[PDB]
Ligand binder design. Structure first.
Ligand code: PLP
Ligand code: PLP
Lengths: 387, 387
């Protein structure tokens, strides 16, 4: 196995800081390395494994579709695509009834930004500081992180950033020249920072009043992650374009921009496209993922375990803890010091995999099927490494 | 099946020109609609189905990996990723030894454009008129088709377009401020126009003289499509960044930017990324696709059947034919009038599925495993509809 680890490390582009291990298999919220060590996975593909590694229903759907048909373009109708379309719109508000399937979160946001420009005839985009929308140039234009943009300037213009949750700033930024406002209901990469009900309500109101579109990015908050199927359900608003990805296909690369009928209608024929977008394999996986989410009402699990887990983390008697925040099982543990060393020790000494969300934050994105006993071990492991 | 067909038509964003049938399954170069009618597929997912629909090896790899692990990020090594890296670089020139896996062709080119800017510290991109690089905003900036860009301006600047195969124009355009030149060895959507050896040699020579990178987009030409493993093998040049997708994963969404090590190391840690990029499912599919390609030296079927197929098409006794061009099984039949009506007749009257490559060109991208007898049936169908 060392040979394969070496091959990956040596031949990789090198932009990633790869950990010293080789993960070979996963089941539920657990994964094993090449040496047989078992880990509690709170990384879960960065929020992709919501339904658990190797979800039986998704695996079965993938196997059966793989034997049937994998390559069929959007110009040629295929049953699993129609099924995905009705299955996805069925779990959304009546207004979000037109689907543009893609292969990633950044592609979903790129689609949203393009549909917004075609519909409004405007150019300006308004995003939030610390907001993250993707790495391709369009999505990157509305992504805040300076280090993520600077090396690649100039990007798509014009874009204006406002402080997250700053209602007055948002009010002054949105005008008759604004094509769209793009926001995450809970900033992920930004440090696990939930939006206030007043901020999203204001975003919905101001966009409608000025003729701009509201794009809500639920690529990370969607699919039950925050305690509801979608975070917007918790805030009581319905966007003009909803972007989804990560857990949408239960692990299979899949994303989507779901929009209102009038928005979709404005797009010229042939105005946008994607080779893999809407492919039958991903459609079959998406249908299975959504059907599983619905049947199990898995979001209720995150709504219960989330608060419990966060309360346990807050109760850890460590003077190194600054705050525990988030929604459902989208959790952030902020320390009064650098988190990197503790994340490494969690992996190396406790076999608990976790992420970061800023230099002082430990982020947890465990599959929503994670057992309470495993979350207990995570709390104990965090306490141990902080001692 | 009617309900699923109508659900797809109605719930779709509407940007696609969807045909009036439902394709439910495929095997080899044949596909079936919901009524049991069998078609010869020269669309093949727009060049994705190179190894044939339901390729046994890819299907088995997909099924087995699906049961094992699907979601694992780039920060956590996983064996299939290392295997994909060494398997892919093993079939490429030694210079192309660093891989950045992605989920689509446009993502591959977005990565190429970003790595180019980071490496050179320059901004300008040079592309060819009629060139197609993708629909996300970065790739769209270097894509020519006005209908694809107009509703979304402004895009990423600065970009200068030159006529394809115009050596002198290329020499005038590439300068000390040029980060990269991006070209297809054979323009796909552009009308199936092969580059001349002179043009590509010039691109390679001028970019190195001026300090710019050469990005060769083989998303459509790669994986044996033109008679060789990769089209650049025909022209005797090696690019700085090679972009691949479509058939790379045998149908599973997969793309990649393969580059020289000096280019890869220039990218700052965290300077680029992707959630699904490099996932074990796509890596397993890619390994299997490449292994099958290598075992069967599949490009050889395209090398033998392509010239023959083009010769037969060219011999069709119709004054409506202007020229037949292409390389391997990437073929374009240019007519003196619109191709759309004939493509429709091919489908309805002969159960032959084909594409366009500009309004007057009928493009054929059949799986490379297609039977000679079926290509013969295609030639006869074209003759019939043109009569
Ligand atoms: C992960 C993420 C993205 C980017 O999605 P990719 O699939 O990595 O391109 C965009 N927005 C949010 C909120 C995300 O969490
Ligand atoms: C199909 C294609 C692309 C775009 O790839 P997607 O997977 O549709 O994003 C880019 N370049 C070329 C030459 C292509 O044929």
């Amino acid at each position: 196995w060392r040979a394969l680890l070496e091959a990956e490390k040596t031949l990789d582009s090198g932009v990633y800081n790869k950990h010293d291990l080789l993960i070979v298999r996963g089941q539920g919220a657990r994964v094993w390395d090449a040496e047989g060590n078992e880990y509690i996975d709170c990384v879960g593909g960065y929020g992709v494994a919501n339904l658990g590694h190797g979800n039986p229903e998704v695996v079965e759907a993938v196997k059966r579709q793989a034997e049937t048909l994998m390559a069929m373009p959007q110009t040629l109708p295929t049953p699993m695509r129609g099924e995905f379309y009705r299955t996805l719109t069925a779990i959304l508000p009546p207004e979000l009834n037109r689907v543009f399937p893609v292969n990633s979160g950044t592609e979903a946001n790129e689609a949203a930004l393009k549909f917004a420009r075609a519909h409004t005839g405007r150019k300006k985009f308004v995003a939030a500081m610390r907001g993250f929308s993707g790495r391709t140039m369009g999505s990157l234009s509305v992504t805040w992180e300076p280090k993520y943009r600077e090396p690649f300037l100039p990007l798509v213009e014009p874009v204006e950033f406002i402080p997250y949750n700053d209602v007055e700033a948002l009010k002054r930024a949105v005008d008759e020249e604004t094509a769209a406002v793009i926001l995450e209901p809970v900033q992920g990469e930004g440090g696990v920072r939930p939006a206030t009900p007043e901020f999203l309500r204001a975003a919905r109101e101001i966009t409608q009043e000025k003729g701009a579109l509201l794009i809500l990015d639920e690529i990370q908050t969607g699919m039950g992650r925050t305690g509801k199927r979608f975070a917007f359900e918790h805030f009581g608003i319905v966007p003009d374009i909803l972007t989804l990805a990560k857990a949408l296909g239960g692990g299979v690369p899949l994303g989507v921009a779901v929009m209102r009928e009038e928005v979709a209608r404005s797009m010229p024929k042939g105005g946008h496209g994607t080779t893999f977008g809407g492919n039958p394999l991903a459609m079959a996986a998406g249908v299975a993922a959504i059907r599983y989410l619905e049947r199990t009402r898995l979001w209720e699990r995150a709504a219960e375990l989330g608060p419990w887990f966060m309360e346990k983390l807050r109760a850890i008697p460590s003077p190194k803890i600054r705050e525990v925040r988030g929604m459902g099982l989208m959790v952030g543990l902020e320390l009064k010091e650098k988190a990197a060393p503790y994340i490494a020790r969690l992996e190396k000494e406790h076999r608990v995999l976790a992420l970061q969300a800023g230099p002082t934050v430990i982020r947890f994105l465990p599959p929503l099927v994670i057992e309470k006993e495993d979350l207990e071990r995570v709390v104990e492991a965090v306490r141990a490494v902080l001692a």
